[PDB]
Protein backbone atom coordinates (compact mmCIF):
# COMPACT_ATOMS: atom_id res chain seq x y z
CA UNK A 1 0.00 0.00 0.00
CA UNK A 2 1.06 3.64 -0.39
CA UNK A 3 1.40 6.16 2.44
CA UNK A 4 2.71 9.74 2.52
CA UNK A 5 5.53 11.03 4.62
CA UNK A 6 5.57 14.75 5.41
CA UNK A 7 7.99 17.02 7.22
CA UNK A 8 7.35 20.27 9.10
CA UNK A 9 8.30 22.21 5.95
CA UNK A 10 5.48 20.56 4.00
CA UNK A 11 7.89 18.42 1.97
CA UNK A 12 6.06 15.18 1.10
CA UNK A 13 7.05 11.88 -0.51
CA UNK A 14 5.20 8.69 -1.17
CA UNK A 15 6.31 5.43 0.35
CA UNK A 16 5.33 1.84 -0.49
CA UNK A 17 4.74 -0.06 2.76
CA UNK A 18 2.82 -3.13 3.90
CA UNK A 19 0.05 -2.81 6.49
CA UNK A 20 1.82 -5.54 8.45
CA UNK A 21 5.14 -3.58 8.59
CA UNK A 22 6.59 -2.74 11.93
CA UNK A 23 7.53 0.88 12.35
CA UNK A 24 11.13 -0.30 12.20
CA UNK A 25 10.41 -1.76 8.78
CA UNK A 26 8.88 1.61 7.72
CA UNK A 27 12.01 3.49 8.88
CA UNK A 28 14.14 0.95 6.99
CA UNK A 29 12.11 1.69 3.84
CA UNK A 30 12.64 5.41 4.35
CA UNK A 31 16.36 4.75 4.82
CA UNK A 32 16.39 2.69 1.58
CA UNK A 33 14.59 5.37 -0.42
CA UNK A 34 16.07 8.50 1.18
CA UNK A 35 19.26 7.51 3.03
CA UNK A 36 18.05 8.83 6.35
CA UNK A 37 19.17 6.65 9.31
CA UNK A 38 16.28 5.10 11.19
CA UNK A 39 17.49 6.56 14.50
CA UNK A 40 17.15 10.05 12.92
CA UNK A 41 13.48 9.47 12.11
CA UNK A 42 10.75 10.49 14.53
CA UNK A 43 7.47 9.35 13.00
CA UNK A 44 4.19 10.80 14.26
CA UNK A 45 0.60 9.79 13.45
CA UNK A 46 -2.49 11.28 15.03
CA UNK A 47 -0.73 12.77 18.01
CA UNK A 48 1.41 9.74 18.79
CA UNK A 49 5.12 9.11 18.45
CA UNK A 50 5.34 5.80 16.71
CA UNK A 51 7.35 3.02 18.27
CA UNK A 52 9.68 0.80 16.29
CA UNK A 53 8.36 -2.52 17.54
CA UNK A 54 4.66 -1.74 16.74
CA UNK A 55 2.86 -2.51 13.48
CA UNK A 56 1.35 0.16 11.13
CA UNK A 57 -2.06 -1.48 11.02
CA UNK A 58 -2.26 -1.65 14.80
CA UNK A 59 -2.06 2.18 14.93
CA UNK A 60 -4.95 2.31 12.42
CA UNK A 61 -2.69 3.76 9.84
CA UNK A 62 -4.61 3.55 6.60
CA UNK A 63 -4.08 3.52 2.86
CA UNK A 64 -2.97 7.08 1.89
CA UNK A 65 -2.49 8.11 5.43
CA UNK A 66 0.25 10.62 6.09
CA UNK A 67 2.97 10.08 8.69
CA UNK A 68 4.72 13.18 9.95
CA UNK A 69 8.59 13.00 10.00
CA UNK A 70 10.73 15.05 12.36
CA UNK A 71 14.50 15.02 12.24
CA UNK A 72 16.01 13.82 15.53
CA UNK A 73 19.61 14.85 15.04
CA UNK A 74 20.86 12.00 17.30
CA UNK A 75 24.61 11.80 16.37
CA UNK B 1 36.06 27.61 14.25
CA UNK B 2 32.82 26.41 15.78
CA UNK B 3 29.39 26.88 14.24
CA UNK B 4 25.99 25.67 15.31
CA UNK B 5 23.46 23.74 13.25
CA UNK B 6 19.86 23.58 14.39
CA UNK B 7 16.71 21.77 13.29
CA UNK B 8 13.31 23.47 13.16
CA UNK B 9 12.54 21.99 16.67
CA UNK B 10 15.76 23.31 18.15
CA UNK B 11 17.91 20.14 18.06
CA UNK B 12 21.47 21.46 17.99
CA UNK B 13 24.91 20.20 16.94
CA UNK B 14 28.20 21.96 16.68
CA UNK B 15 30.66 21.59 13.79
CA UNK B 16 34.34 22.44 13.40
CA UNK B 17 34.74 24.39 10.15
CA UNK B 18 36.89 27.00 8.41
CA UNK B 19 35.57 30.14 6.70
CA UNK B 20 36.78 28.71 3.38
CA UNK B 21 34.84 25.47 3.73
CA UNK B 22 32.45 24.97 0.87
CA UNK B 23 28.84 24.27 1.61
CA UNK B 24 29.44 20.78 0.14
CA UNK B 25 32.23 20.23 2.65
CA UNK B 26 29.95 21.35 5.50
CA UNK B 27 27.17 19.01 4.39
CA UNK B 28 29.71 16.22 4.28
CA UNK B 29 30.71 17.12 7.84
CA UNK B 30 27.07 16.83 8.85
CA UNK B 31 26.95 13.42 7.06
CA UNK B 32 29.97 12.34 9.03
CA UNK B 33 28.33 13.34 12.31
CA UNK B 34 24.70 12.41 11.68
CA UNK B 35 24.64 9.97 8.83
CA UNK B 36 22.47 12.27 6.70
CA UNK B 37 23.44 12.22 2.95
CA UNK B 38 24.61 15.64 1.72
CA UNK B 39 22.08 15.73 -1.16
CA UNK B 40 19.34 15.31 1.45
CA UNK B 41 20.39 18.53 3.38
CA UNK B 42 19.22 22.09 2.92
CA UNK B 43 21.11 24.60 5.01
CA UNK B 44 19.85 28.12 5.69
CA UNK B 45 21.61 31.13 7.27
CA UNK B 46 19.46 34.04 8.37
CA UNK B 47 16.89 33.29 5.69
CA UNK B 48 19.31 32.55 2.84
CA UNK B 49 19.65 29.04 1.44
CA UNK B 50 23.33 28.08 1.13
CA UNK B 51 24.57 26.89 -2.29
CA UNK B 52 27.01 23.81 -2.47
CA UNK B 53 29.90 25.43 -4.32
CA UNK B 54 30.03 28.64 -2.31
CA UNK B 55 31.98 28.94 0.96
CA UNK B 56 30.79 29.81 4.50
CA UNK B 57 32.61 33.13 4.39
CA UNK B 58 30.69 34.04 1.15
CA UNK B 59 27.60 34.41 3.35
CA UNK B 60 29.52 36.22 6.10
CA UNK B 61 29.09 33.14 8.31
CA UNK B 62 31.62 33.67 11.01
CA UNK B 63 32.48 31.78 14.17
CA UNK B 64 29.59 30.87 16.44
CA UNK B 65 26.96 31.54 13.74
CA UNK B 66 23.88 29.33 13.65
CA UNK B 67 22.65 27.57 10.52
CA UNK B 68 19.33 25.76 10.24
CA UNK B 69 19.10 22.33 8.70
CA UNK B 70 16.06 20.81 6.97
CA UNK B 71 15.66 17.59 4.98
CA UNK B 72 15.09 17.77 1.26
CA UNK B 73 13.44 14.30 0.93
CA UNK B 74 15.05 14.14 -2.48
Author numbering:
A (entry chain B): 1 to 75
B (entry chain A): 1 to 74
Quoted from the paper:
We obtained crystals of Lys33-linked diUb at 9 mg/ml and the crystals diffracted to 1.65 Å (1 Å=0.1 nm) resolution. The asymmetric unit (ASU) contains one Lys33-linked diUb. The flexible isopeptide linkage formed between the C-terminus of the distal Ub and Lys33 of the proximal Ub is not fully resolved in the electron density maps and no clear electron density is present for Gly76. Lys33-linked diUb adopts a symmetric compact conformation in the crystal structure with extensive hydrophobic contacts between the proximal and distal moieties. Ile36 patches of both proximal and distal Ub moieties, which comprise Ile36, Leu71 and Leu73, are present at the dimeric interface. Further hydrophobic contacts in this symmetric interface involve Leu8, Ile13 and Leu69 of both moieties. The Ile36 patches of both distal and proximal Ub in Lys33-linked diUb are buried and make up the interface, whereas the Ile44 patches form a larger hydrophobic surface and are solvent exposed. The compact conformation observed for Lys33 diUb is distinct from the compact conformations observed for Lys6 and Lys48 diUb. Intriguingly, the closed conformation of Lys33 diUb is very similar to that adopted by Lys11-linked diUb. Taken together, these results reveal two distinct conformations of Lys33-linked Ub chains and the compact and extended conformations observed are distinct from those of Lys6, Lys48, Met1 and Lys63 chains. It is to be noted that the diUb structure was obtained from crystals grown at low pH (pH 4.5) whereas the triUb structure was from crystals grown at pH 7.5.
Ubiquitylation is a reversible post-translational modification (PTM) that regulates many cellular processes, including protein degradation, endocytosis, DNA repair and immune response. PolyUb chains of eight different linkage types can be formed since the seven lysine residues (Lys6, Lys11, Lys27, Lys29, Lys33, Lys48 and Lys63) and N-terminal Met1 residue in Ub can themselves accept another molecule of Ub. The topologically distinct polyUb linkages are recognized by Ub-binding domain (UBD)-containing proteins to couple ubiquitylation to diverse cellular responses. The enzymatic system we established allowed us to assemble large quantities of Lys33-linked polyUb, thus enabling structural analysis of this atypical chain.
